[PDB]
Structures are given as C-alpha cells and as structure tokens.
Design a protein around this nucleic acid. Sequence first.
RNA 1: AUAAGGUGGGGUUAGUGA
Lengths: 1340, 653, 34
Amino acid sequence: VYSYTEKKRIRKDFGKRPQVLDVPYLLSIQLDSFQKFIEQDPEGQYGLEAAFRSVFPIQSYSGNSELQYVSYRLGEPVFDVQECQIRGVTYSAPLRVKLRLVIYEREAPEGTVKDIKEQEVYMGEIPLMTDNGTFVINGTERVIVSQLHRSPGVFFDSDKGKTHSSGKVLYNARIIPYRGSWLDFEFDPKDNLFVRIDRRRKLPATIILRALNYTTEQILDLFFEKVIFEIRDNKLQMELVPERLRGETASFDIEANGKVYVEKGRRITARHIRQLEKDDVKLIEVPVEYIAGKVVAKDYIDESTGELICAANMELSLDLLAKLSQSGHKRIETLFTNDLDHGPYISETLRVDPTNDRLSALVEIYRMMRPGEPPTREAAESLFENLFFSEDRYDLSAVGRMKFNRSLLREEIEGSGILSKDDIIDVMKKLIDIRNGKGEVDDIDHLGNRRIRSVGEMAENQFRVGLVRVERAVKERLSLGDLDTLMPQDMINAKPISAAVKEFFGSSQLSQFMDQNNPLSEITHKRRISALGPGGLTRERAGFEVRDVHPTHYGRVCPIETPEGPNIGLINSLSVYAQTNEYGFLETPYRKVTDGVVTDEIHYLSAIEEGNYVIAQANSNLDEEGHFVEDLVTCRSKGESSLFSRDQVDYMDVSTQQVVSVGASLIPFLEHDDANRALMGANMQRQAVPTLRADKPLVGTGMERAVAVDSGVTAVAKRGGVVQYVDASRIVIKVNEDEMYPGEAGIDIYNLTKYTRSNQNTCINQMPCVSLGEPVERGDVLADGPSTDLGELALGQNMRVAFMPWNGYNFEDSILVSERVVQEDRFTTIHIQELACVSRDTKLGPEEITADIPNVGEAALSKLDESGIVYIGAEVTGGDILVGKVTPKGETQLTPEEKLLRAIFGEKASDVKDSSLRVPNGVSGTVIDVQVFTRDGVEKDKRALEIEEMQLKQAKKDLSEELQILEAGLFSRIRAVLVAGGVEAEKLDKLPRDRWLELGLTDEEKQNQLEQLAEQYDELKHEFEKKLEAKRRKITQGDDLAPGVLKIVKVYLAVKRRIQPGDKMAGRHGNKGVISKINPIEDMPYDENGTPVDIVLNPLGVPSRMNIGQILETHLGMAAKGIGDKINAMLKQQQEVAKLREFIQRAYDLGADVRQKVDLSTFSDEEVMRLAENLRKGMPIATPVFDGAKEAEIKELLKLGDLPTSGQIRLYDGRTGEQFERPVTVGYMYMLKLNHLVDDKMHARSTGSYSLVTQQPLGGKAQFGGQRFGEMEVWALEAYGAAYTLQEMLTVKSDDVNGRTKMYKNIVDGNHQMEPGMPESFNVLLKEIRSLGINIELED
Amino acid sequence: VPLDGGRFATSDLNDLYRRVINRNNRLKRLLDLAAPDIIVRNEKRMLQEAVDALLDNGRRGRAITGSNKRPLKSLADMIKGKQGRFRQNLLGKRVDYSGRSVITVGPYLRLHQCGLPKKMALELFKPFIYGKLELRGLATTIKAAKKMVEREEAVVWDILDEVIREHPVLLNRAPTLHRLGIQAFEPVLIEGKAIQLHPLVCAAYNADFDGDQMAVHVPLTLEAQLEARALMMSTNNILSPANGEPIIVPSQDVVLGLYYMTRDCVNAKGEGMVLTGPKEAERLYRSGLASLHARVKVRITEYEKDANGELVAKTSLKDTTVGRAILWMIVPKGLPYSIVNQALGKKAISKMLNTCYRILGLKPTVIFADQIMYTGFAYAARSGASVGIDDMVIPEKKHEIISEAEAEVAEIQEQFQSGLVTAGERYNKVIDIWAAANDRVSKAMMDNLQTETVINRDGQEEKQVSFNSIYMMADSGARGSAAQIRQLAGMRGLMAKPDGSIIETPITANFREGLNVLQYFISTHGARKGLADTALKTANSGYLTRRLVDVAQDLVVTEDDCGTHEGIMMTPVIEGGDVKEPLRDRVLGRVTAEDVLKPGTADILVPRNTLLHEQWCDLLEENSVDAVKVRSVVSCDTDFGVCAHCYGRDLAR
Amino acid sequence: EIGRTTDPVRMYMREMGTVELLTREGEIDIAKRI
RNA sequence: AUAAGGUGGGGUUAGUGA
Ligand SMILES: [Mg+2]
Ligand SMILES: [Zn+2]
C-alpha cells in the first residue's frame, strides 16, 4: 500500500533484512539545538533563562542599588526571509526584555526599597533560522557546524615511554573545567607529586594541600595508614595485620607465639600469611633496628620541656627512639610503605616543599601566578579563592559534575559548579592508586570523553560573554548611581551585546559559508562534526591517533567519509541513525533483545554504557521469532568481534545502514569496493552540479526519497488536498475537509522559487511535477527542485557505457564521449553571475547613471534604455556596457554669485569623465534581472519606477486573490448560514453577495452571525487596505544603504555552458575523468542491433584502483534498461493492460525474499498505464548498503531480459566495420559532471599590472595575473645547464622595470637582446636591512 | 593603499613608526619639564620596548597588536619565514608570459611537439604579433595593432600561425621534484581550450589525467630559444639522471596491446602455413584470413653492425607468430631478431628500447618509440580487451581451506579453553596457520587462473596460458600484480590494528563477494592510517630535499683531470645471503683509479684511466674480476670543484 | 625571584606602590611649601 | 589601456603500490 503519488513510479527493491525502524528526520541536530535556544523554558536548564537567571539579580557595589529579571519576549522580524536575501539584512528578530529595577533605602540592604520601576528594554537582534536550518546574515546563507570538543571532567594519562628515555612511565592527572582555570597533577622520575596551574611552572602538591588549610598530621593522616609501634616490655613491640607482610621478605626472623613462621631468606607467602592469620595474632616483636628504617607518622612532643621530640616526615634514628624511650610516650605512629603496594610518595613531596604555614603557601601561589610583584595577604587569599572557588570565575558544567562523580566513583550525578577540597583529595588518592597499580589511565579518543556542542550552546556562551562585559559597565554606572533619575537604559547599551553576537556570526571558525550546488551539498554540510575552532585543535599539530578511527566510532561517526587533504579525520561526519544525548554525547540506536526473542523496540545507547553489553550484528539470520537460527553468532563485546553463544546477547543492530553516513548511503554496492575509492566517491559525489533536464538513476539505493524530502529545496504539500490550479509560477491546493480547520477554512497556495543565484553561482529552480484535478497527500512532493525528480534525489544522468581501449583517447583516465550526448544537450547547465555598479557621492559632487557618455560609439548605446540601463533580455558579450556611469569632475555648486552668472551666461560647463560598468572580458550571456536600491531622499529613476510599480502590482495581485478566496469563504459561509433560517436560493444571488445580511431572518444568533461576518467583512476591507498600503510603504520607501553611496544597481547575467574537451566528469566510484575528445557518432562502437554506445571508459582503471562496484553497477543498469525497453517495445506496439500487467508483475516478483511483495492487481488499469510510461525509459531499482542484490538475482533479471547472461556483447567498429574479437562489457552507468570546468581554469597573461611594493606581476586569475615560478623548478633549471633562461626569466620577464620595457621594445622592433640591470626585490632587500641598523654595500 | 571605499588598509610599519616618534617627542617634552625620575624612567623603558618592537616584535616577552588582537609584523619577520623576502620574492618570482590550464591527451602528436589552444597562444605571443604585424605593414601604428589583435580579424591567424613555426615553449607541473618536470615542446595550435599532450611524457611528469593542471612559459630571447631546443627539448632527455634506465618507457595500455600481439593460442586460423615476408602477414591479417595469435614459419631478413658499423643483410626461415612478424616491420635495421621472439612484457620492451639506444644511437630510438606507440594503440583498440564479472574466477577449494583452518583455530582455542597453552602461544599458532592457509588460497587462485585454457590442437587437448583479461593485465605488467588480484579473487590479507599490531581473525571474504560490516570497518581503519601517513610523509620529504639541496648547491664540474691515484674500491655487495647488487652496475661508467690487473697473474687487463662502458664491463665480467679501485669524487684533488675524470658519466647523455 | 616581569606596567606598579595616599590636609601642608 | 588589491579566516583541487 502506498501514496497515490508514490504509485507514479514504484521502485523495485532488493533486500532480505526487514527494516524495523526508518530514518529519522535528518536535520534534527540543528533544529532541536537552536529550537532549545529560544523558547520560554522555565527551570533554567537549558537556555536563555540559564543566562539571565545565571547572572541576574545584580546589586551595586554595596550601594544598595539592585536590578533584577522579569522575563524576555522576542518580537517578530521586520522582514521575511527571501526579501532579506534580496536586500542584505540580517534575518533577525528583536530582543525585548522585561527587567525590573529597585533601589533599597539607606541603612537598609535588607530593608524595603524606596522605589521600583520596570520597562521592557531592547537588546539587539539575534538571527533566526530557516526551516532548512541555515542562517541568513548579510544577504548570504551561512551555516554553523557543531563542534566536537573535550568534555569537562577529570582524566588520567600515562605519557608512556618516550619522555626521558629511561624506560619508565609517568602518570599525570588533569582537570578540565567548563569555564575557568586548568589544574594538573603529575609525577617525576624521582617520584614526587607535582602540581601546576594553567600549564605554568611546577610546584609540589603538598603546598596546595597546606593552601587548603591542612596541617601535617592531617596530611599524613589522609594519604596513609597508621602503622602501630608501641612502647611495650622491650624494643617497642609491634601490632600487625599480616596482610602487610605480602610482597616483602622477612627482614628479621618474623615470629610470634614463641613460634618461627618465616625466617630470614623467605618472603612471607600468602601461604605464610594464611599461617599467621590462621593463628590470628597481632602483637609481635621486632628488633629495634627495624624501627630505624621507619618514618614517624604523627608529632610526638616532649612532656616536661613541652618541646618537639621529633617531627613528622623524618626517618627514625635509634637515638630518637631513645629520646622518646626516655619520654614515656607509649604509642608510636608510623605509616605503611611498600614500593610494590603503597609507596610513600607524598612524603618526599612534603620534604621538598620549603613552606610551613597556610600563609606562606598562599604567598608562593600568589608569586607563581602573578610573577614579579610584592606579596599581599588578601591578594593571595582572594586570588586563591578566585581560581577555584568563584561562582563567577570558575565553573564545571553539570555535565562536568556528572563525569566527575562517575570518574571518582561517587553516586549522584549532580552537585556544585565550583569544586571543594574533598574533590581534590579524592583525585590525589586516585592518581596515587594508579601509581600503585590499581585502576588505569584512559585514552582520549574514546568517544565517551568527546562531547559535541551545537549552535545554541555556543550562542549561549557568547551571549554570556556579552552580558558580563556589559555588566562590568552596569555595575560601574550603578555604584555611582544617582537615585531617582535613571531608567534602565542608561546602564544598558545593546551595542556590546549586538557587537558580541554579530561578531560571532560574522567571523568565526565555525560560522563558515554554505556551499549550495546540490541538495546533498547542504545536507551533508549540516551534519558535519568539526574538531577545530575555539577551544579546539589546530590542523597542523594533531597526532595520527586523533586523526585515526576508534572502535567507539561504530554507529556514531561515519568511518569512511572525511575530507582528503590537510585535515583528514578532523572533520568527521555524523552517522545516519545517531542522535545526541541530553548531555551531549552520541547516542545510537539498538534493538532490545530478550532471552531468545529480539524485541522490536528501539533503545538508545551511549558510548561508555555500550561496552558492558554484547551486540547482535545486523546481518544475522533470525527466523521470524526473534530466534537466530544458529547457535553461535557474530557479536562484539568490547571493541572486538568474536563468536558468542545463542543466549549471551543483549541487543541487536537496528539496521544495516547505521554504520555509514548519508554521504555514502547513496553509493550503490558500497561493500564491493576499497575504502579509498569509496571516500573519493563520496567527496567527489558531493561536488556535482545540477543539470538542465534532471533524470532518475537506475541503480538507486533507497535513500533518495529521504534526502530529497528533507532537503527543503523541494516544496512539500503541508496538508492532504486536491489540486485546484496548476501554474508554472504558483500552485493552488484545495484543502480537504477533514484537515480543514473549522475556523479559517482557507486553501493552500505555494509560490515556487524560480531562477535565482545560488551560493556557488548556479541555477536553483523548482518545477511542478503534478497535474491538475488530482488528490495529493499531506507530506508529499509537489515541486521538483534542482536535481530532484518526482520526489527523488538525482544528481547527474545515466548513459550507455563500455569498457575498452580505443585509440588511446582513453589512455590514462581520459574519457571519450560520443557526439550524441552533446546533441541531446544533456549535460548543459546554467550559471548565473551577479554584477553590481555603485554610485558614491564624493566631493566634487555626486555621480550619474544616465545614458549620456563622452566618446563611445553608438554600438553600446544601442542596447541601453533611456535611463542608461540594458533592457531585460538583451544578449551581451564581453566588454559591453551595462550601466553608463559618469562622474561630474568639475561640477561647481557655488554661491548665488555663480547661479547669478549661470542665469546670465547659461549653464554650459562642468561635464567630464566616465566609469561605466562594463562586462568582464571573455564572458557573455543574457540579462535576466535588474535590481536597483536607492538611498532615501534621493530621486528614484524611471526604470526604478517601472520595476517598482511592477512589484507593487504583483503584491496587490496576491492580496487581491487572497481577499477573493477568503471573501468567497465568508460570503459562501453566509450562504452556508442562509440554508436554515429562511433560505432564499433564488433571492440570494439577485443582488450581489454583500446584502446577504438583510433578508428575512429571525432575531437570533444567525442574523447576529450576519452582523459579525459583516464585521469580519469590514476588517477584510480595512485590513486589506492597511496590508496593501503597508506594502506600499515597504516598496515605495528609499531603503538604507552603506554610508556614502547613493544607489546600487545589481545585474544578473545568465550563462549557458555545454561541455568542452577538458571538463572533469566522473562516476560514483572514485572513477574520475577529464573528457578528452568529443568524437562523432559514426566512429563509435555499435552492436549488431545498431545502437551506438555513448561513453568509452578504460579497463585499466579497474584492477589497480580496486572498485568493482562500477562494473556490477554496469551489469545491473544493463538489466534495468533491458526491462524498460522491453516494456516500451510492448508499448509503442499496441497492447492491452493484461500483458503489461502480467509482465511487470513478473518484473516485480524476481526470485528471492524481498521486502517489496507488491501486486499489480489492486490498480486502476490507468495508473498501470501511467506507471507503464513511467517505466518506458527504464526501471528504477533500489539496493541497500550491505543487503543488496547478489549475482544470482542479477543473472536472473538479465534472464528476464533478452540480454545474454555474460553481459559481454560483441561489438562492431564504426571505422573498420567489423567485429572485435572477445566481446566486451556494456551497460548503463550513472555519471556526473563536476564544477571544475576548463573555462575558468584556462588563463594566460602576456603583460599586465604590476605590484607596487615590488615591481612584480600579481598573483591569481581574477587579478589578471601571472604564474609563480617556484624555486623547485629553479632547481630544475640549474639542474640543467640552462644559464640564459633563468637570468632572463628571473629578471627581464619579472622584476626590472627597465629590462622589461626595453625588451618589450625589442620584440616590437624584432630584436631579441636581453639587458640585465638589477632585480628590484634585491634593491628593496638591501635598503630594507639598510633601514635596519646594518651597513651593507655593493663594492667595486 | 586604500581598500574599497574611503578606508585604508594600513601597514604595520607605519603604525609602529607612529608609535616610536610619539614616544620620542613625549620624552623630549618631559625632559623639558623636569619631571621626576619615575616618569622619565618609565618613558625610557617605553622607548626601549618601542624600538625593539620596531626591530623584532615577539622576541620581547609579549608582542603587540593593533587590531584583531593579532600580533603585528616587524621588520625581522619581513625577512625570515615562509613569506619573508628570501623564499617569497627572491628565489621564486611571479613571471609574465605564462599560461595555465588543464591537460588532456591527443595521441596523434609526435613527441617533439605538444598541443596548445588558440586562445592561449593568441594571448601569449601578443608582442610578436605586434612585431611581425608592423613588419608586414597591415597596420602602421601600434594602437591599430591593439585593436586588430582585440577585434580578431582573420589575417592574424596567418600571423601567429607563422610565428609559432619553430619557437619552443616550456611546460611545468607544480610538484616539480626532479628535473624532468620541465621539458620543452613545439606548439601545434588546437581548436578548443585544453592543453593536449603526448602520452609518453606523462610517466615522466607523473601526471595522470585525473584533472592535473599544467603551466606553460615562453622563453623570449634568442639564446634561450637555443637553450630550449638545445637542452630542454624533450627528445634530448630519454634516460634518467638517476640511472641509465629509459624514462620514455611505454606506460600501461600499449604494453597491453603488444602483449596481446605476441602471444599464441594453440590452434587458430592459418595454423602453421608458410610466408615469405611480413607484408604478406599484414595482408593476411587485414584480409582476415589468419588469426593474429597464430604461429607460422615465415622468412624474415635482418641486419647487424659487427664490422666498422657496417650493416650486413642475412636471412633465414624463422618460426614465429603472425604478430611478431607484424611489428618486425617497425624495428629499424640494426637489431637481432630474437628481441621480439617472446611475449614482450613491460621489462622486455624497456630493455629493447635501452639496447636500441646503445646500439643505434638516438634518432632510430626516437622514431621507433613513436611508431610502437602508434601500433600499440592500433592493435590495442582492435584487440577489444574488456573486463567482466565472469572473468574473476573463485577457486572452489577456498571454502574447504577456510573450513579446515577454522577447525584448527578451534583446536588451538580448546587448548586455551582448558588452558593447556598460554595467550601468546595460541596467538602465534593461530596467526601462523592463517598465514599458511592464506598462502594456500593464493596459489590456489593463481593455479586456477594462469593456465586454465585447455584446448584441442588439431588433436585432443592441450593446456596453455589464459586469455582471461585480468591475467593479461597483470602478466604483461600493465597495472597490478598477484597481490592485487589476490585481494580480488582470494581472501584479502590480515589487516593491522590501530596499535600497530595485527588482528587475529583475517578478512575471510573478497571483493567479488560482499564484505561484511566489520571486515569493511577494519579495512577503513587501515586505509585512513595509510593516506594520513602519505600527507605528513610528504611534508617531511619536501623538507629533506629543501635542506640538502642547500648544502650541496655549489659543486661544479670545473676541471678535466685531477691527475691522482686515490679513490675507493668497488665490490659486489652481498647481504649475507645472495648477491643483492652485482659488480657490473656499481662499476658501470666510472673511470678507474689504477689499472685492472687481470687475474691471469701480472696481466694488465684495462689501463688505469679508462671509461668503463659496456664492452669493458663485459670484458672484466668474463674474467670474473672481484674488485676495482676506481676514481671517486671524494678523492678528486680539485680546488673548488671536481675534475670530470673523477666523476664519469652523465647518465642521461 | 623578580620574575623577569616584562610587562612595564607590573614594575611600574612596583614603583608607584611605594608612596602611600596622602590625606587632603597634607595637601595643605605641601601646597603651603609650594 | 581608468579595474583595480594589503591582511586574516574558511572551503576546495592536484600530487605511490611493496
Ligand atoms: Mg593525478
Ligand atoms: Zn679529480
């Protein structure tokens, strides 16, 4: 079952795997992001309210003046979209914010305010987006790419190996905040725990411990265990858990209960620990020299003298054991050390800190952070608070809190934004534990640590920057706030705000320009994931591994699609089915798999939560029950594929397409080719250029409906209806009654986009694909836009092709073509240029536009109007004059003495110059449109008046048709009220429709409805005039322009471009080609039937560049064409519906298990016919990515045709007239042409302009410039013996003014005689360093 | 300069000059006012940072910016770096009289000429048009000629038709690594606007026709035209400067055509008749009465110059094919016959051209090379060499070899299930048996392909080499190898992992079938790692050449003969196994230090100061001499140079 | 430990921080001396 | 010959098979 519209051309589909869940809406990232940017959301997270509530309320500098927040309300735009595309404005809505200002009384921060006030003040504009998601900034169409960046949180790294060449790893811990100061912990080979702040100089960690107000026994309390010696009978006997005896040899004969367990010579095994704890004793004796190797934990002081016996972090001496032995302190606290297990690392870190108390530690923090200034108490204190404890100057996101509490194994995902002590202490514990051997560091390229941003996050961030900077201003003006005289727009300036946000969308690393030459161009330019930008990487200092793919990329990032060149792998593109997390990670779909049953629900998985589970791969043959027919099945556990059991599984892949992007889901038979030529297939496939006559591709991939719809370059029926009125320009739909709203009945009118200039100077245009008197469906295509056909996306065209070397015109990769192709004109495209002519008012007067000119012939004057402007449609060539612009050089504008003597003598004088806008050289074409913008208060010209009234007339035509139809709805509603309550069907239409209130009707709500419909009638009248007149005020007015220009005249020139030997055109498999020779028809190869082939490729590209999918594609295209022309063979031959019905019924059965399963029997015998002439040019055939057709089916479908099974037909040359031995492969390949045409690549320069800092020719083509003779081919010249060549070319042809002038004279005098002179760039060099303090001269 | 409008694109230098004299004058007025030492102290420090901020910004601890928060440019960086004047505007300048566009083929040219478009020609030679146009008096004054070359009158096509008669031009491709990247041609004017290019130049340029652009130049003066035709002209360079191999080797498809020419199916039309001369063989082919790959005893006649360069006729009845006797007519006079009596792979035709250069000089090698290009595309096109999906043949034993292999990893795997083996041992045994089974599939598909053709021959049956298109394209040496067809028919490889180690499960499938999801996923790991390495590897390699071209830079062969007796001792190198580089190539073309004592005990074979060309190398090659002390450039006693007798041969001349 | 503070502002603060703020009657004292 | 022309940023093109 289908739409009525889908039955115009149903596509044959292969594919065994039943799809369970379709594609999502494609533009979902941009739309839910920036949708989430502006809406009235409560509860702060996430949005604008997070910005305002995050910063408001704001008080003065304790002057008890405070402003607060109420609400915001964003107004409508002043302009629509496409007019803003015309004029150059920002498509942007105003920002109106209700604040509130109070002022507290004196001696009363807490007291009642004396005065309040509230106004809704204005703060700049922010751009909207279109429903195609783009932004419009200054006439242009721009797209912001989402940024991949490192999630804030805490991380652990080795930096193994290569540092210090000692074979020893390090371990370092890093905190990344969302906004604030970095903080890094690390070790050394000498094994001390060092800390640095914001990548600065190195300090030991215990100084930041003392900075957090901790004493020494607290430190050694935390980071270690208490190890208990006690003064006892003799030699300070030991309390011991024999767990501590693991991993060390018995230093003495370790013995207890009078019993020797482990002697000297044995390590105490876990067997021996089991002996001891089996006896379960702790009170043992060590000899006293065991204690001299130990470090006391706490500080035992003397009792009598009250003095320090011994401090912490110092190794015991036996004499100190005597000093405490005579003291009588019975307890002795020490710490545990095992270099295998619990190394005493931070002890020596407490040795190398020179500091003692809180305050000095604060001093060296203050001195390392602001170096070179005298220390101060509270500057150090408040500085140290402002590095980590400030709600302004420091923040973790809630994402960062989530990553944090996950990382240190906490419980609840929420918490503070700034951090506290226990955070840091736990971090140091964790890093110590990795130093010990438990836990592990984590790779960065794991996708659980990379977070995507989006639009609204970044616009939020820039907006926060603007608000706090303008708040620095506001707090300044408020602390000096003179009361009762300030309304809150003297503190508020919108110009910092609008300066910040228009700075952002103007110039960013991520607000990059949109390329528009393809629906697939934009639709892959919006799903781009960059890793560059602010807070991002650089293209030149990323390693190989961050460019590399990671086994967490599966299903979330496309593996194969990346730009080749200077940034490979940094500009990754998103998958198909992937969505984003609430938090901003990459969630991916799966199927819930129960015990033996694959549940058909979907279920999203993050990155790190995936790894616990085990995943059924998509192409696993289950049999209708959830039950896989096998007992082992290919699954993946943790980044590895291995064969697992039948019941271990947890989840299944949704579909076979989730591994790839849309950029390669269009590739048919993608699985049969190498990744290199696949990558080149995608990226070259993007750059295709739309043709004149679009055409469907035979070997489709099933995605073409989705990308055709979701690209909004087609126009889709918003509601189900019936066609009323077809036109080439507009289209009119009668809305069906069920979807018709009860109030406001109405109809649908869509206005198609005609010929307009793209971003890339190409023709974008929409065509009606529907007939009249026809039911349409809600959500169905109506307008074929550019490179769209019948709701299907179709780039280039498909043609007959064959594989043989043919006289070397297909030597490397050059492509020979027949003349039939260009005779059908089926690669011809349209290009559109936009040219402008300005009119600045300078000193010595304005400038003029008219057809008055000095001293050119009447040839260019023939093709202007009376105003000096070319007519619409006058075909021009290069060098022609579009608009005659002249300057009055020598205009006077003097005193009335002048105007007196002008009245006396006449006005003859002050006429000179010309600066007419001329057509660029070598281009030609046809004018299709003129735009004129006029500065206000300047007199509009005649042609501006005609185009002005023409726009006016169009507008009143549109509103007039609106009032015709809605008026018909209202008075026809009045006939729909005068059915009951006095119908007069003869007397309703005698007088016209206006006096339908006042027939004989009772005193009820129906005559009342006649009255309020006379009301609605009246606001149709009056509102009709005010909308029409407001439109007159829009079009009539003089619009703003740049300061100093009077009028700008835009000219649209239209070029037709066919094809020429030297153009790049290519298939969909990385098979490039420059087209070599357009060779007449008679020399083509041709079959016995007589048909020419059209394009002859080269067989040598196949075995090296392994892309066999082109020849499989070629066979299948041969089969499809065989079916379609078999149909048309039965169709130009007269034949009834039955034979066609049976035949193409068979042609949709086709062997194996498919999802297609359709019948012809449910049809009208006319949509059978309509579909039959849709099939007479070929049969559209789908193919999924990995579940496409096999060899047996394609041989079967060739067998349905009359083509031979091998697919290699014999040929005949058109020149020899005889058979090639070894019959060759033919078939149909779908091919593209690319917009590298040779017309703008070809360039030369004899002698042009010169640069001024060095007399050297300019670079580039647009500047009519020469080539660079780089130094490598200089090395190639002196690699030969060519002496005169590079002296000549290096000097005369380039640098000396004298040598090139004289040599120019010698050529025009027929002499060839160079003159050396001296290169000018040497002269600027040595007078440059001569301007530096260096005496340099040229000697004798 | 101004930008578009009333604003002005500033220079940095003018900005900091403004700063420094503002600084100076304020310091002067402060000295006038007798300020305290704090202020004038501070100001002098400001002048210090001002002046060095002029000299070298950034070498002081923090730089300065004017706008865009971006550090402005001092005088020091105006010299250093990738766009200071040395590498930017002194070694590489932009040049007039140049053009640039996209290349294409046009094989009908001879190799001493190239295609050139009419528009680019009419732009590049405009002053010559002015000169001869003044000479003929078609227009007297200059601006008349300006509008004549603008308005396109028909007379000028005769004129630039005339002046491009013998005026050479240069071509350039942008990655100009070694010195064959610049060669010269004689332009033939072309309707259209792309540059047509002879095919044999493409391999020397490494310029595939995927869309490479090339640039051209014109030597203006007379002496440089003589340098072009004398040295830059493409007929000069046929041997590499790196080695004496020809670089005008036929590239890819002509060798397919010739390989298809000299072959034989075992029974064909005209099987084994007789014939007196190759013209009759041509009549038999174009008359279509015998097959092309069909053997026939013919009469041929040849020449040789054993005497004083003297060419002698002699003849016989060789047994050969048809097509060997066909392309025998293109070969010039001084060759042996048996140069063409085989299947003529890319190597055989390469050394064919090489010995043609060694024996018959220059010009017959040249015109011979053009002619074999013509017949190469002729019979390649008439051959009709396709490809098909049915051409790739799956070995039927593949399924069973994989089957026993997975049984074996089940056996070692169950040795690890009960833990009889360790991890790395199971690892290594599994990866070894996958290596072994992989090789079994490799010679499985090779043995299936290479000789699959089994046919009658006027009798019962006989095997011979295969007429499969792939096996011809790999066997002839056109493109690809056994490794790439191994990746087509048989299983492909064991792909590495991102760690740099190797994955235990091989990619069992092949490209003719479908790969799965994950095999393809592993493969795109390997590919991305590959071409990323190409990017950064290019970046390093250019820097290596950029460096050591500077350290040499200066050594010029300036003298004849140093007259010394030092030098080094050449021996054939042996790795420790086979000789991996023989004697005769390390010796070839380097003049000895002392005389070659023959190992006849006290016999002088070769004197002490002789060039060793091929005859001498065969001479001591026969006497099995093991070592020769030779003159080297490390021992040349020349001041500021190298004598030629310490260096030896040109290797392209 | 004067940390090469190449900002001249920083050291300029280090000199101007020597003299403390005078009250307004000390201005009477000094302008008296003037 | 009146189309000219600095500085940043972005996008793209062309550069192996063992
Ligand atoms: Mg190339
Ligand atoms: Zn020497």
